[PDB]
Design a protein around this ligand. Structure first.
Ligand SMILES: [Cl-]
Ligand SMILES: [Mn+2]
Ligand SMILES: [Mn+2]
Length: 220
């Protein structure tokens, strides 16, 4: 089984969530084929080496999952888009681009945080370099945050991303509204599975060869 979670918004002031995440990593995650964390794992992020005991503890708990044989992957959210390679190495996670297609048990599945779907130069390299100065997953987040500091997902964006990636399944979070949506893409049926935030209960998408399901579980 391949597991997907997001929107934990971990912080020192919310230790029950952190405890529930540790239980998850030490139990369910150990039995998975892989674990995908689709952004907003932390409420905020600046420096990979910030003095934060919470960061050290989470990195070691995640690294203990991957060390046990369960690969771990991370797609940045709008809260933790500065999380970098150093922390990925500390935690044993692979960082993924803002949109990624997986081949899960014969099916193509698009994963992303979901904020780039909203829910509120190229020809010349020397010129292109200037635009790609920061990784795309940082450039778009920084621009949106700056605009929002100065002053539901868009359906056209959903379709457009599923036709661009030739995909009938999409998993994301960000909106904090867990649900399963049906739609049309690529002249076929398509589905968009939305994760929930961990403010009061955990949630995951569990994908197997036979089933996908959106599951909620208490922190215990
Ligand atoms: Cl934000
Ligand atoms: Mn979130
Ligand atoms: Mn978000």
């Amino acid at each position: 089984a391949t597991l997907f979670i997001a929107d934990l918004h971990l912080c020192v002031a919310a230790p029950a969530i952190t405890a529930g995440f540790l239980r998850f990593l030490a139990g369910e995650a150990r039995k998975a084929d892989a674990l995908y964390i689709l952004g907003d794992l932390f409420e905020a992020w600046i420096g990979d080496d910030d003095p934060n005991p919470l960061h050290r503890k989470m990195a070691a708990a995640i690294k203990a999952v991957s060390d046990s044989g369960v690969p771990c992957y991370f797609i940045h959210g709008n809260r933790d888009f500065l999380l970098g390679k150093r922390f990925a190495r500390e935690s044993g996670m692979t960082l993924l681009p803002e949109e990624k297609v997986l081949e899960l048990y014969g099916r193509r599945v698009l994963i992303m945080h979901g904020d780039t779907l909203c829910t509120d130069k190229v020809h010349k390299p020397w010129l292109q370099t200037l635009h790609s100065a920061l990784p795309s997953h940082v450039r778009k987040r920084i621009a949106a945050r700056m605009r929002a500091n100065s002053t539901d997902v868009n359906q056209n964006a959903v379709v457009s991303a599923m036709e661009k990636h030739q995909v009938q399944w999409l998993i994301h979070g960000h909106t904090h509204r867990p649900a399963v949506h049906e739609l049309i893409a690529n002249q076929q049926p398509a589905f968009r599975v939305v994760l929930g935030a961990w403010h009061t209960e955990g949630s995951m998408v569990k994908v197997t060869a036979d089933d996908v399901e959106l599951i909620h579980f208490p922190f215990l």
